[PDB]
Amino acid sequence: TSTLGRRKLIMGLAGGGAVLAGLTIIAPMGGMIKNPWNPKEGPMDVQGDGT
Amino acid sequence: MKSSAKLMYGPTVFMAAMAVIYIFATMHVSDGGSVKGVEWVGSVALVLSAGLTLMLGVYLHFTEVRVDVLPEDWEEAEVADKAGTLGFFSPSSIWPAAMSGAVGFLAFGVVYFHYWMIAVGLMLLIFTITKLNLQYGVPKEKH
Amino acid sequence: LWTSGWTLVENDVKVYLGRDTAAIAESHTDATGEHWSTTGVSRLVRMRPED
Amino acid sequence: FVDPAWPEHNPADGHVVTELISKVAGASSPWGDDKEFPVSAEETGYVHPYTRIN
Amino acid sequence: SLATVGNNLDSRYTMASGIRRQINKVFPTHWSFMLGEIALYSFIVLLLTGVYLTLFFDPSITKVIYDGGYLPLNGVEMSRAYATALDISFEVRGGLFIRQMHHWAALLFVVSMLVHMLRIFFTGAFRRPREANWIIGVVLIILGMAEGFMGYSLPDDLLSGVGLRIMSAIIVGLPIIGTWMHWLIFGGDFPSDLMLDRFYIAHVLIIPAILLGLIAAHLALVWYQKHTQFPGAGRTENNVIGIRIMPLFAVKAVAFGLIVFGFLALLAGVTTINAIWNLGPYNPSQVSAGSQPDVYMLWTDGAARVMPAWELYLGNYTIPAVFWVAVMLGILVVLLVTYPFIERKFTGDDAHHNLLQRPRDVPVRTSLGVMALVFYILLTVSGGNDVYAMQFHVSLNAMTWIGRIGLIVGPAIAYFITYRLCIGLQRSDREVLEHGIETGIIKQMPNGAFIEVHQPLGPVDDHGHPIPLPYAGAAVPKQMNQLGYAEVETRGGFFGPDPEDIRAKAKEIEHANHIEEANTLRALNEANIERDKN
Ligand SMILES: CCCCCCCCCCCCCCCC(=O)O[C@H](COC(=O)CCCCCCC[C@@H](C)CCCCCCCCC)COP(=O)(O)O[C@H]1[C@H](O)[C@H](O)[C@@H](O)[C@@H](O)[C@@H]1O
Ligand code: HEM
Ligand code: HEM
Ligand SMILES: CCCCCCCCCCCCCC(=O)O[C@H](COC(=O)CCCCCCCCCCC)COP(=O)(O)O
Ligand SMILES: CCCCCCCCCCCCC
Ligand SMILES: CCCCCCCCCCCCC
Ligand SMILES: CCCCCCCCCCCCC
Numbered sequence: 001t002s003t004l005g006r007r008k009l010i011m012g013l014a015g016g017g018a019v020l021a022g023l024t025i026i027a028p029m030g031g032m033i034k035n036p037w038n039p040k041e042g043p044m045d046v047q048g049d050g051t
Numbered sequence: 052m053k054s055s056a057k058l059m060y061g062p063t064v065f066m067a068a069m070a071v072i073y074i075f076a077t078m079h080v081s082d083g084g085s086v087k088g089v090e091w092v093g094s095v096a097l098v099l100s101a102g103l104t105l106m107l108g109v110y111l112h113f114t115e116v117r118v119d120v121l122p123e124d125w126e127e128a129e130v131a132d133k134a135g136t137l138g139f140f141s142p143s144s145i146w147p148a149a150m151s152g153a154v155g156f157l158a159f160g161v162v163y164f165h166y167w168m169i170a171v172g173l174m175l176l177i178f179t180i181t182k183l184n185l186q187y188g189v190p191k192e193k194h
Numbered sequence: 195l196w197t198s199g200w201t202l203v204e205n206d207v208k209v210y211l212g213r214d215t216a217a218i219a220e221s222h223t224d225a226t227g228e229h230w231s232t233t234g235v236s237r238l239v240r241m242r243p244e245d
Numbered sequence: 246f247v248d249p250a251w252p253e254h255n256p257a258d259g260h261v262v263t264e265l266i267s268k269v270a271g272a273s274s275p276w277g278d279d280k281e282f283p284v285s286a287e288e289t290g291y292v293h294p295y296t297r298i299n
Numbered sequence: 300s301l302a303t304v305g306n307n308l309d310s311r312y313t314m315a316s317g318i319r320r321q322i323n324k325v326f327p328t329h330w331s332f333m334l335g336e337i338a339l340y341s342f343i344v345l346l347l348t349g350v351y352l353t354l355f356f357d358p359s360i361t362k363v364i365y366d367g368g369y370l371p372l373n374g375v376e377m378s379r380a381y382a383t384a385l386d387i388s389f390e391v392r393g394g395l396f397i398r399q400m401h402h403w404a405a406l407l408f409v410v411s412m413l414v415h416m417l418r419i420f421f422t423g424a425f426r427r428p429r430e431a432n433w434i435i436g437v438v439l440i441i442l443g444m445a446e447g448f449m450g451y452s453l454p455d456d457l458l459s460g461v462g463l464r465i466m467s468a469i470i471v472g473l474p475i476i477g478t479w480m481h482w483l484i485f486g487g488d489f490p491s492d493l494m495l496d497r498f499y500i501a502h503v504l505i506i507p508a509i510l511l512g513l514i515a516a517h518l519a520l521v522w523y524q525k526h527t528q529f530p531g532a533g534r535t536e537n538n539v540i541g542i543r544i545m546p547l548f549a550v551k552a553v554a555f556g557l558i559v560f561g562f563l564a565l566l567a568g569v570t571t572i573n574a575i576w577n578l579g580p581y582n583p584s585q586v587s588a589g590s591q592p593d594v595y596m597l598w599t600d601g602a603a604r605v606m607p608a609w610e611l612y613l614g615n616y617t618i619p620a621v622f623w624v625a626v627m628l629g630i631l632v633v634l635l636v637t638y639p640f641i642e643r644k645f646t647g648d649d650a651h652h653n654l655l656q657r658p659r660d661v662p663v664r665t666s667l668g669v670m671a672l673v674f675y676i677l678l679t680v681s682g683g684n685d686v687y688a689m690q691f692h693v694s695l696n697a698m699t700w701i702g703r704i705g706l707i708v709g710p711a712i713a714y715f716i717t718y719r720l721c722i723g724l725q726r727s728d729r730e731v732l733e734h735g736i737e738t739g740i741i742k743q744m745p746n747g748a749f750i751e752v753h754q755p756l757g758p759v760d761d762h763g764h765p766i767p768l769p770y771a772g773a774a775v776p777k778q779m780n781q782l783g784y785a786e787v788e789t790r791g792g793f794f795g796p797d798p799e800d801i802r803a804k805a806k807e808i809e810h811a812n813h814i815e816e817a818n819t820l821r822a823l824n825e826a827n828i829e830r831d832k833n
């Protein structure tokens with residue numbers, strides 16, 4: 001009765017939209033991502049370069 | 052309004068004549084109790100003051116040409132001649148009070164010179180004016 | 195709640211009136227990375243009755 | 246195209262509304278000037294809601 | 300593939316009748332029956348943005364020299380808490396966005412509950428049998444306020460630190476055991492070690508757990524009473540008229556759910572909140588002019604401002620002036636919690652009410668509510684009366700006196716006006732039932748009498764003059780557009796006129812539709828009558 005099965009475009013775009021929303025929500029988790037091969041800021045100290 | 056459109060010509064022509072006297076008498080007469088030169092406030096605002104009366108007079112004149120003899124404009128008219136409908140008058144509304152409150156908010160906004168207050172007051176006024184006009188148009192609640 | 199730092203006056207300590215100069219730690223980078231020294235820096239300084 | 250709600254008038258020696266003239270002395274009714282009121286309570290579709298408390 | 304997943308999920312949980320019951324629950328549709336969802340969605344955002352926020356935050360008071368993203372404040376000695384909170388906004392990618400989302404969500408949460416409580420109060424949804432819900436909810440709002448308070452005190456900046464100084468000195472100045480209690484909470488003199496630790500462990504665990512538990516209990520208890528609704532056509536006190544859980548309610552809940560989520564995501568970016576980099580580390584000597592706690596905590600601070608210097612000296616002991624503030628706030632809480640009991644003592648009516656009541660029909664309660672709202676608002680304004688005084692060019696002493704006097708005459712005027720307006724609304728409601736809708740058709744009769752056309756909502760006797768319909772507890776129409784006498788009768792797009800062929804049928808179909816709807820609604824009414832006479 002929802003008549004959603006007939007609307008291929010609506011449900012297709014809705015899937016994409018929902019996926020993009022989900023990815024938008026979880027995106028700030030990329031603040032945790034750090035490059036292991038980027039030396040820490042400042043000159044090399046007695047503990048090395050951080051790598 | 053047969054006579055209403057006509058009586059405005061009186062003030063119109065009067066003020067038009069005074070405005071032209073004013074300009075010529077102020078720029079060419081040295082009195083000793085003032086200086087010589089056209090005055091740019093009593094001239095513009097008296098030329099354009101005649102403009103208002105002319106505008107209203109002409110509009111009412113064009114309007115009154117294409118109106119029939121109304122019972123209110125007829126000298127010997129029976130009370131039963133206007134028997135009918137006098138159009139639509141709003142019985143009640145809360146929106147005049149609201150939009151007065153909105154102009155008050157914008158007023159204090161400008162007084163204190165707070166940008167947020169001016170902005171809010173401006174859009175608080177648009178809303179209330181909109182609701183005033185759409186009062187009798189609000190559709191039956193669709194479920 | 196009876197005591198503050200001024201109670202040191204009672205037990206024969208000489209406390210001055212220390213004005214806050216809001217001094218911060220100083221960066222000193224040399225051959226072994228960067229370090230904040232905060233030595234030789236005094237944030238409280240003595241004050242005179244003409245100051 | 247002419248709106249359904251537009252009053253049924255002869256388009257000959259008569260105009261219902263122009264720039265400056267009209268047929269009423271006042272504002273035209275927003276529910277059709279040719280609408281006859283009042284009507285029967287049935288047409289309004291108002292259902293008086295019987296309620297009992299407690 | 301789908302027929303078989305259900306088959307082997309039902310064969311082992313016998314859940315066919317249990318699930319069918321849940322998906323067939325009917326919920327009343329009213330815009331004011333959604334305000335509770337806003338609190339729920341904001342709470343979900345808080346606990347989700349909060350968990351992300353704890354991966355970068357160190358709640359330690361240990362002093363360090365700052366070297367980080369914020370190039371100012373480099374070399375400045377601060378706590379470990381302040382340095383990490385300053386790092387989650389200048390060194391974490393999208394950390395300021397999440398921090399601001401968190402704070403905005405906190406604000407919305409408290410306002411999502413306050414407005415909800417107002418809806419519950421005004422409509423009378425706290426009556427029998429719904430008093431556990433009222434008590435649970437009241438505890439929810441107090442704990443929400445407490446949670447918010449200990450949340451913005453975590454960064455340990457200069458602004459929040461003064462709040463803690465105020466709070467500690469409120470506790471310490473309590474009769475008899477305010478000294479021992481203060482030392483038991485902070486673990487010593489203020490500030491102390493294990494002071495940002497006890498607060499951090501009670502803001503991310505103790506309060507959340509308590510709140511979640513109360514919320515879950517609250518919702519389950521609501522689902523058991525299957526809501527309440529306004530009086531209307533066909534709806535009695537032993538039924539619910541609305542929409543089923545699926546497919547209509549569940550989708551609407553999600554739609555509104557993400558709407559709130561998306562709105563909080565907008566403010567988190569476009570609007571600054573709690574700019575802690577401008578405030579500096581906490582120092583007991585430094586203070587600022589605008590030291591207001593937060594909007595939900597303003598009323599407590601406003602109470603402290605308008606309380607006169609009324610100290611009681613008792614020889615070797617003293618009662619501070621702020622003690623009376625505590626007493627007053629305690630009374631306000633007690634009055635709020637035990638409202639259903641006080642309302643039913645003075646009304647003498649406890650009769651298992653399932654039908655709501657419009658605020659206009661309960662003038663005493665409505666007026667008490669507006670009286671209390673003015674009290675709360677005046678306390679809130681007095682709480683930030685130093686920013687009011689400067690920005691609006693008013694004497695600060697005058698503001699204090701306005702707060703002091705206004706707490707007595709403000710509530711009184713609010714009650715009077717509100718009561719009169721409630722009765723006024725009642726009167727306007729009776730004119731329509733007695734005479735009909737005032738149409739704007741001022742006809743002139745042949746004699747010259749100007750008469751307004753009245754549209755009866757009921758049967759007339761002989762010559763107009765409608766038989767007066769009795770009040771029914773529902774909203775009476777007041778305009779002729781509320782009966783669809785202004786409905787646009789031209790189907791099509793903005794430019795598209797739409798073929799008449801398809802335009803005739805659609806108007807006919809909608810006409811038959813609302814006829815059938817009205818018929819079914821009035822049949823429901825009739826059923827109730829002949830059911831209530833047995
Ligand atoms: C559940 C479905 C999961 C689907 C995943 C899709 C989710 C979309 C959002 C993902 C988060 C954002 C993606 C990229 C975000 C980004 O741009 O980060 C850079 C990027 O990485 C690189 O370059 C190399 C490429 C690495 C790929 C990155 C994409 C992440 C995907 C592949 C991993 C998730 C999939 C796993 C499933 C998860 C389930 C859990 C098991 C790091 O360069 P960097 O230079 O270290 O920058 C530092 C500052 O970030 C930092 O603040 C610091 O302050 C700076 O110092 C600086 O170092
Ligand atoms: C944590 C914040 C709160 C949340 C998330 C919440 C959630 C809800 C929800 C989802 C409902 C279902 C009906 C509706 O939406 O109106 C509801 C109903 C209710 N809530 Fe709340 N609520 C909260 C706070 C409060 C407060 C503070 C009170 C009372 C002081 C309260 C008392 C009630 C009552 C009486 C109902 C029943 C309404 C009815 O059944 O007609 N709630 N709540
Ligand atoms: C229960 C509802 C909650 C409310 C009302 C609330 C309120 C707040 C507020 C107002 C702040 C200050 C944020 C700022 O500085 O801008 C804050 C900070 C914080 N909250 Fe919450 N919070 C809640 C729940 C949670 C939960 C469940 C967690 C953890 C699981 C959490 C973890 C944090 C953390 C880590 C901070 C860090 C301080 C900061 O980075 O500013 N909160 N909270
Ligand atoms: C509900 C109770 C709230 C408690 C407040 C207590 C009362 C004290 C209020 C002090 C007001 C200070 C005003 C002021 O100084 O103005 C300004 C300072 O604060 C503000 O900007 C007020 C922001 C308030 C939100 C307005 C947002 C407008 C966008 C609307 C889009 C939907 C100074 O003027 P300015 O910003 O330069 O234009
Ligand atoms: C009615 C008194 C008017 C004041 C004197 C009028 C002066 C006439 C100006 C004529 C100037 C000729 C250019
Ligand atoms: C050098 C004398 C020129 C005088 C011109 C007078 C004009 C005044 C009316 C202007 C109307 C503008 C709308
Ligand atoms: C034709 C027999 C197989 C289909 C019967 C329905 C399977 C059980 C559905 C239970 C639904 C619970 C979610």
Ligand SMILES: CCCCCCCCCCCCC
Nearest residue numbers: 667670710711712714715718
């Ligand atoms: C907390 C006590 C409530 C008492 C409310 C009385 C309000 C008095 C207003 C004056 C009413 C004049 C008729």
